[PDB]
Design an enzyme around this catalytic site. Structure first.
Site, PDB file in Angstrom:
ATOM      1  N   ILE A  80       0.531  -1.162  -0.016  1.00  0.00           N
ATOM      2  CA  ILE A  80       0.072  -0.076  -0.146  1.00  0.00           C
ATOM      3  C   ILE A  80       0.974   1.240  -0.134  1.00  0.00           C
ATOM      4  O   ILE A  80       2.023   1.429  -0.253  1.00  0.00           O
ATOM      5  CB  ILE A  80      -0.877   0.164   1.275  1.00  0.00           C
ATOM      6  CG1 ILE A  80      -1.487  -1.307   1.413  1.00  0.00           C
ATOM      7  CG2 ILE A  80      -1.982   1.179   0.727  1.00  0.00           C
ATOM      8  CD1 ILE A  80      -2.595  -1.157   2.611  1.00  0.00           C
ATOM      9  N   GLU A 100       2.686   4.473   1.676  1.00  0.00           N
ATOM     10  CA  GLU A 100       3.437   5.143   2.899  1.00  0.00           C
ATOM     11  C   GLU A 100       2.616   5.913   3.751  1.00  0.00           C
ATOM     12  O   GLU A 100       2.024   6.945   3.333  1.00  0.00           O
ATOM     13  CB  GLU A 100       4.575   5.906   2.215  1.00  0.00           C
ATOM     14  CG  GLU A 100       5.563   4.994   1.573  1.00  0.00           C
ATOM     15  CD  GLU A 100       6.045   3.758   2.129  1.00  0.00           C
ATOM     16  OE1 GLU A 100       7.054   3.753   3.252  1.00  0.00           O
ATOM     17  OE2 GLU A 100       5.335   2.557   2.219  1.00  0.00           O
ATOM     18  N   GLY A 101       2.673   5.598   5.078  1.00  0.00           N
ATOM     19  CA  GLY A 101       2.188   6.311   6.256  1.00  0.00           C
ATOM     20  C   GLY A 101       3.407   7.413   6.744  1.00  0.00           C
ATOM     21  O   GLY A 101       3.152   8.418   6.413  1.00  0.00           O
ATOM     22  N   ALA A 102       3.945   6.980   7.725  1.00  0.00           N
ATOM     23  CA  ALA A 102       5.224   7.736   8.313  1.00  0.00           C
ATOM     24  C   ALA A 102       5.887   6.790   9.145  1.00  0.00           C
ATOM     25  O   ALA A 102       7.175   7.032   9.514  1.00  0.00           O
ATOM     26  CB  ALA A 102       4.373   8.832   9.182  1.00  0.00           C
ATOM     27  N   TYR A 103       5.537   5.574   9.649  1.00  0.00           N
ATOM     28  CA  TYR A 103       6.279   4.798  10.344  1.00  0.00           C
ATOM     29  C   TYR A 103       6.915   3.787   9.546  1.00  0.00           C
ATOM     30  O   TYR A 103       7.856   2.805  10.324  1.00  0.00           O
ATOM     31  CB  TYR A 103       5.192   3.879  11.444  1.00  0.00           C
ATOM     32  CG  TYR A 103       4.443   4.990  12.363  1.00  0.00           C
ATOM     33  CD1 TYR A 103       5.218   5.121  13.752  1.00  0.00           C
ATOM     34  CD2 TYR A 103       3.227   5.617  12.090  1.00  0.00           C
ATOM     35  CE1 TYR A 103       4.437   6.119  14.603  1.00  0.00           C
ATOM     36  CE2 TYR A 103       2.773   6.609  12.891  1.00  0.00           C
ATOM     37  CZ  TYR A 103       3.300   6.533  13.839  1.00  0.00           C
ATOM     38  OH  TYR A 103       2.637   7.653  14.964  1.00  0.00           O
ATOM     39  N   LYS A 142       0.725  -2.059   9.060  1.00  0.00           N
ATOM     40  CA  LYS A 142       2.044  -1.150   9.205  1.00  0.00           C
ATOM     41  C   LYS A 142       3.156  -1.824   9.974  1.00  0.00           C
ATOM     42  O   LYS A 142       3.015  -2.308  11.245  1.00  0.00           O
ATOM     43  CB  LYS A 142       1.530   0.261   9.603  1.00  0.00           C
ATOM     44  CG  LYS A 142       2.465   1.056  10.050  1.00  0.00           C
ATOM     45  CD  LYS A 142       1.982   2.318  10.525  1.00  0.00           C
ATOM     46  CE  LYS A 142       1.063   2.105  11.932  1.00  0.00           C
ATOM     47  NZ  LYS A 142      -0.043   3.061  11.947  1.00  0.00           N
ATOM     48  N   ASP A 152      -0.541  17.166  14.483  1.00  0.00           N
ATOM     49  CA  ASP A 152      -0.099  17.135  13.278  1.00  0.00           C
ATOM     50  C   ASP A 152      -1.144  16.736  12.203  1.00  0.00           C
ATOM     51  O   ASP A 152      -1.058  16.083  11.290  1.00  0.00           O
ATOM     52  CB  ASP A 152       0.981  16.109  13.058  1.00  0.00           C
ATOM     53  CG  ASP A 152       1.648  16.160  11.651  1.00  0.00           C
ATOM     54  OD1 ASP A 152       2.002  17.244  11.340  1.00  0.00           O
ATOM     55  OD2 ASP A 152       2.056  14.836  11.138  1.00  0.00           O
TER      56      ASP A 152
END
EC number: 2.7.11.24
Lengths: 16, 345
Positions: free
Chosen positions: B20, B22-25, B43, B138
């Site tokens: 999938i 990208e998130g941040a982790y 994730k 954020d």
């Protein structure tokens, strides 16, 4: 759907 | 168990591993939950060598595990090794969401009905977050997940803090963030003492962006950011300068050239007047004058959706924030081991 619950019928669609 | 590069062993329960966005982790995959018989989102995390990756991973988990709300992403399961020694990665399983506001704003022109319903859900979720005495800190389009039926969910609480009066540190601006376009002006002017109003400012930026498909304050750095803000709002009034307590920041503002306010209807000529009146109350320079989440939901622009009988609040607000800075990563990895325990056999 929260929207139906509020009585909104507008078919909100997403294209992506 | 096969995503571009490494071990994504989400055991037997999860299979059919697709890749999938990208998130941040780190790496995020989609998968099939052979237990609940539905596709989910997964994730992979590996933050144990970095004090701050650990802090954010622990915050995200402590908070999301304790939140339960229709407009807030939840944690369905957490996969990690049997003993604190074998634990190097962490897989967080959540509801699969089709897309996010960031992707949507790049491809679709949102009708006023879409804008109204998205903004309402963002605020309904925020009302719950703030009622728990938590600041998200954020909010931005990519943190607003959506399904194919326009149901919206706020995610990524790695930078969230409990609004704990008895302690709040300096250095938030210096944190690494993918973008600063949604940060309130006080974040660039005072060193701390941020309130819930920084989340309302971010929502105002998101609303503005839904109105024109373009970020309203796309600065290329802190100084440029504040310049975009002042270029539209105009120079702060003597009254506004009173909310800036930092000496160098106040001197910096008085050294800046005067700027007039740009009328909202000039920037957004095709927008609903009520949406602009609300935008104006959310993008108020002075943190204390900025509209509150509850007043925002009660705004006329959102009248067809406001319903305080169906807008949950946290039963128990968090009263204290966690001392995670004075804590070595080993004690963080530790706490992360305890918080993820509830999912082990």
């Amino acid at each position: 759907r929260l929207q139906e619950r509020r009585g909104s019928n507008v078919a909100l669609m997403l294209d992506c | 168990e096969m995503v571009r590069g490494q071990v994504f062993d989400v055991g037997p329960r999860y299979t059919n591993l697709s890749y999938i966005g990208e998130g941040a982790y780190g790496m995020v995959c989609s998968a099939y939950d052979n237990l609940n018989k539905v596709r989910v989102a997964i994730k992979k995390i590996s933050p144990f060598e970095h004090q701050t990756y650990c802090q954010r991973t622990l915050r995200e988990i402590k908070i999301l595990l304790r939140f339960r709300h229709e407009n807030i992403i939840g944690i369905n399961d957490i996969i990690r090794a049997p003993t604190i020694e074998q634990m190097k990665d962490v897989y967080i399983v959540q509801d699969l969401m089709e897309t996010d506001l960031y992707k949507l704003l790049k491809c679709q022109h949102l009708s006023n009905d879409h804008i109204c319903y998205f903004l309402y859900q963002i605020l309904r979720g925020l009302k719950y977050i703030h009622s728990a005495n938590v600041l998200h800190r954020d909010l931005k389009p990519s943190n607003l997940l959506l399904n194919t039926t326009c149901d919206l969910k706020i995610c990524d609480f790695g930078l969230a803090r409990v609004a704990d009066p008895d302690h709040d540190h300096t250095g938030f601006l210096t944190e690494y963030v993918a973008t600063r376009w949604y940060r309130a002006p006080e974040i660039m002017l005072n060193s701390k003492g941020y309130t819930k109003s920084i989340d309302i400012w971010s929502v105002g930026c998101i609303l503005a962006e839904m109105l024109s498909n373009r970020p309203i304050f796309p600065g290329k750095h802190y100084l440029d950011q504040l310049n975009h803000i002042l270029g539209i709002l105009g120079s702060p009034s003597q009254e506004d300068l009173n909310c800036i307590i930092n000496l160098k920041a106040r001197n910096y503002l008085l050294s800046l050239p005067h700027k007039n306010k740009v009328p909202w209807n000039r920037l957004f000529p095709n927008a609903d007047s009520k949406a602009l009146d609300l935008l104006d109350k959310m993008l108020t320079f002075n943190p204390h004058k900025r509209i509150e989440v509850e007043q925002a939901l009660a705004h006329p622009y959102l009248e067809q959706y406001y319903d305080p009988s169906d807008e949950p609040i946290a039963e128990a607000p968090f009263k204290f924030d966690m001392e995670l800075d004075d804590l070595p990563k080993e004690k963080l990895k530790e706490l992360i081991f305890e918080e993820t325990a509830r999912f082990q056999p």
